[PDB]
Amino acid sequence: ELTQPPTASAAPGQKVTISCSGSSSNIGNHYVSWYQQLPGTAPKLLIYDTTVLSSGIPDRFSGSKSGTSATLGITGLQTGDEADYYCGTWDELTSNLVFGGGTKLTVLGQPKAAPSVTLFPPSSEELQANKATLVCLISDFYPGAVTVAWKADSSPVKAGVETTTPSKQSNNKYAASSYLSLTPEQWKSHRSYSCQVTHEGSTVEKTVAPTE
Amino acid sequence: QLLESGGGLVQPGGSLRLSCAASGFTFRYEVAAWVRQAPGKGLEWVSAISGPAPKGYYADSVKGRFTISRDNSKNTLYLQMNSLRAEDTAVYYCARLRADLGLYMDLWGRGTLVTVSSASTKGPSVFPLAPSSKSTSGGTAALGCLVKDYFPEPVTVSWNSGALTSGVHTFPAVLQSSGLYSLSSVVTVPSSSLGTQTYICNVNHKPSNTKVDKRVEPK
């Protein structure tokens, strides 16, 4: 029964506020707490008892409560603040601890980064076990929009293609993976296989051959 | 720091006991809580337990089915999860709950993924992604480990037992049309080093209680 805006946006050095909206039964009456969840990590306490900063949290972060609305304040916005932010309090109507839906905080004007693409062919071990997986790994790119296509002798191949959702790294760049599952025969049959990674109009294609 | 264990695969209508050990402070004289986070979705409180006795409070979602307790000796917090369904599929965190002025959790554990699904646990097949002097070399050579056909999530990968961290990215897993997961972990290293240096990826699959140390050698 706590409501935040799903997304928040601002540029480096700017002030961004994340509103947590509720009623008199939660925010209006009880003490609010904010949490910061960086990609892949567990939630970390930002602010407790409405205004008090947790250990290590810089003064850039501020907690407010005006009527039925709790406001998380972030001044001098830095890219290291990109995270999901959750408000938490006690709701009187229910008999439980409540959380807001969460607010994804994007930091705008981050520098465009061309992806680093690495294509590995099937390992000796896998081919010995009568399987062939081409592993295309894509790292250190921004923004997070990439597409991975596979060619076999410059012919488009769709069967066996499994691609991960592009996910944010620890340094705020994005990482993706693509897998082309084959039999050892299909691998050795064709002259070459290619991982075509498209990012911001431009395409990085890496090739591997069964005859190394 | 707190650390949870027990996370793994359970069938609809199945049962699981989650553990949480306190490495520093005692559990018997602090208010302990469990919080869960379903994939994609936000934070949701599960249960809380006060210091004096094992009289716990549960969220409306988990009341009855779930039973919180602590072994009074060796700072151990348990969560008995019974009559589980797909909706309970989430990362479960143990944590200290402060309840003097405001209700908030200041200490959090790493968390452990519970997956409710009608499928079998499968340990990973780990294959080395050998470094070459072509596609795996961009000024510095890149090598990795392929962690293929495992269920459920998660797996974690360190390198040389955590002695190697700089250059490491462990990628997200993808659920293949087979209903089995694949993920990779590479490390970028100066090409000069390859020959000398020994490379072991430490693949961890707690849901199947499997640990694979795979040696990645120059092909």
* Experimental method reported for this structure: X-ray
**DSSP result, B75-89:** TEEEEEE-S--GGG-
Residue with tokens 């760049």: A173
Domain-by-domain residue ranges, chain A? 7-107, 116-208
Domain-by-domain residue ranges, chain B? 2-116, 125-216
Contact assessment for residue A73 and residue A64, using Cβ atoms and an 8 Å cutoff: yes
Q: Do B43 and A102 touch (CB under 8 A)?
A: yes
A100 touches chain B (CB under 8 A): yes
The closest alpha carbon to B35, from A37, A78, A178, belongs to A37
Q: Do A43 and B172 touch (CB under 8 A)?
A: no
Of the candidate CATH numbers 3.40.50.280, 2.60.40.10, 3.40.50.2300, 3.30.465.10, the domain formed by B125-216 belongs to 2.60.40.10
* Beta-carbon contacts of residue A66 (< 8 Å; ≥ 6 apart): none
Q: Do A181 and B108 touch (CB under 8 A)?
A: no
Three-state SS annotation for A109-152: CCCCECCEEEEECCCHHHHHCCCEEEEEEEEEEECCCCEEEEEE
Interface test with A, best of B62, B92, B135 (most A CBs within 10 A): B135
Q: Do B103 and A120 touch (CB under 8 A)?
A: no
Resolution (A): 2.2
Select from B35, B109, B184 the Cβ nearest to the Cβ of A135. Answer: B184
Q: How many CB pairs (< 8 A) connect A and B? A: 145
> Is residue A49 helix, strand or coil?
coil
Residue of A nearest to B47 (CA): A96
Instruction: Quote the tokens at residue A35.
Output: 């949490």
Q: What is the CATH number of domain A7-107?
A: 2.60.40.10
The closest alpha carbon to B183, from B140, B134, B150, B216, belongs to B150
Buried b (16+ CB within 10 A) or exposed e, B23-56: eeeebbebbbbbbbbeeeebbbbbbbbeeeeeeb
Which chain B residues are Cβ-neighbours of A176 within 8 angstroms? 171
- Tell which A residues from 129 to 148 touch B, by Cβ distance under 8 Å: 129, 131, 133, 135, 137, 139
Q: What is the DSSP letter of A6?
A: S
* Beta-carbon contacts of residue A55 (< 8 Å; ≥ 6 apart): none
A174 touches chain B (CB under 8 A): no
Domain B2-116 part of CATH 3.40.50.1370? no
Neighbours of B153 (CB within 10 A): 18
- Backbone dihedral region of B179: left (phi > 0), alpha (psi from -120 to 50 degrees) or beta? left
Which chain B residues are Cβ-neighbours of A116 within 8 angstroms? 138
Q: What is the CATH number of domain A116-208?
A: 2.60.40.10
